Amino acid sequence: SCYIYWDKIKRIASRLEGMNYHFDEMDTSGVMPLLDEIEEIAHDSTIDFESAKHILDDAEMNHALSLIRKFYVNLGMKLEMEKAQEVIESDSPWETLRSFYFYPRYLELLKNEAALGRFRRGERAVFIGGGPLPLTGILLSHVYGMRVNVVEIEPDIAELSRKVIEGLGVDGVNVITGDETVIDGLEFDVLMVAALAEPKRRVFRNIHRYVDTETRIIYRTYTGMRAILYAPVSDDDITGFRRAGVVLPSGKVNNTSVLVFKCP
């Protein structure tokens, strides 16, 4: 094969090489054009899923793919961290939050997930992998009227995220510091897993031990050319579960959302 996107990807990657192993030092505003380049390819609806797989699975693409994924994960983390701090310091926290680069996609992502998982007011949600800016948790309560526990493994990140929630004056959203195993002492209707929650194998194996067959579990992954951004959840990762539904993204939304149930 001979896809035009192959060379386009190699070229972008060539301009990332010089940042390798130090992407966390990126200037956030300065690198937005690079994210645009990458997203032009990721979001191209003329690329079929078989062609995307052809490109992303080729051994000659391994190194370029690694660079793009490192860039993406580090930019996302830094953008969230910076916005969390801005929200806490703001006189207009909800307006500040609404200016977050990814805010509109999150609204769409959540709308997708709420249909998939049939969310209702007063249902209890647990979200694994809150991060510094726990936007999903916030919207679960703010839009969908759910009662929410967000789980975050890093104590300092957890503390920041609580300050964001409090700054906004959002109710019914609590942050629990811990690993995924904290769900043992929770009672909940819906469990969600962040796209960035890692390592997938350990996390899903632990979830399997603590949910029953009625618990709606939604996790986020990457399909098609969007898999250029981040490694998709593998089939091995979700052993012991059955897939019940999927929402594939459109527009600028990156994540595919997957509904699974514990077997049987």
Ligand X SMILES: N[C@@H](CCN[C@@H](CCN[C@@H](CCC(=O)O)C(=O)O)C(=O)O)C(=O)O
Binding letters toward ligand X, positions 65-94, x by CB under 6 A:
-----------x---x--------------
CA dihedral 90, 93, 99, 104 (to 10 degrees): 160
Among 177, 181, 206, 223, which residue interacts with its own copies (rule: CB under 8 A)? 223
Question: Is 136 labelled a binding residue?
Answer: yes
Q: How far is the CB of 235 from its own copies (least distance, A)?
A: 5
# chain residues binding ligand X, by CB under 6 A: 21
Q: How far is the CB of 33 from Br ion (least distance, A)?
A: 5
Among 25, 36, 46, 184, which residue interacts with its own copies (rule: CB under 8 A)? 46
Residue 54 burial class via C-beta count within 10 angstroms: exposed 0-12, middle 13-18, buried 19 and up: middle
> Is residue 187 part of the contact set for its own copies (CB under 8 A)?
no
* C-alpha distance across the termini of the chain, in Å: 42
Q: What residue has token string 């009672």?
A: 187
Question: Is 82 labelled a binding residue?
Answer: no
> Is residue 143 part of the contact set for ligand X (CB under 6 A)?
no
Binding letters toward ligand X, positions 1-30, x by CB under 6 A:
------------------------------
Residues 179-198 that bind ligand X (CB under 6 A): 194-196
Q: Which is nearer to Br ion, 128 or 170 (CB)?
A: 170
In sequence order, which residues have a C-beta less than 8 Å from that of residue 209 and are 6 or more positions away?
none
Q: Which string of DSSP letters, residue by residue, matches 39-61?
A: HHHHT-TTS-HHHHHHHHH-GGG
Pick the piece of the chain touching ligand X (CB under 6 A) from 123-131, 140-148, 183-191, 206-214: 123-131
Binding letters toward Br ion, positions 1-40, x by CB under 5 A:
--------------------------------x-------
Q: How far is the CB of 230 from its own copies (least distance, A)?
A: 16
In angstroms, rounded to a whole number, what is the distance separating the alpha carbons of residues 135 and 58? 35
> Is residue 60 part of the contact set for its own copies (CB under 8 A)?
no
In angstroms, rounded to a whole number, what is the distance separating the alpha carbons of residues 131 and 149? 13
> Is residue 23 part of the contact set for its own copies (CB under 8 A)?
no
In sequence order, which residues have a C-beta less than 8 Å from that of residue 62 and are 6 or more positions away?
none
Q: Which string of DSSP letters, residue by residue, matches 166-205?
A: HHHT--SEEEEES-GGGGGG---SEEEE-TT-S-HHHHHH
Question: Is 214 labelled a binding residue?
Answer: no
**Of 127, 118, 177, whose CA–CA distance to 147 is shortest?**
127
Q: Which is nearer to its own copies, 20 or 239 (CB)?
A: 239
In angstroms, rounded to a whole number, what is the distance separating the alpha carbons of residues 155 and 179? 11
Query: In the chain, after which residues is the C-to-N distance over 2.5 Å, breaking the chain?
Result: none
Q: Which is nearer to its own copies, 53 or 69 (CB)?
A: 53
Binding site for ligand X (CB under 6 A): 76, 80, 102, 105-106, 109, 129-131, 133-137, 194-196, 220, 253-255
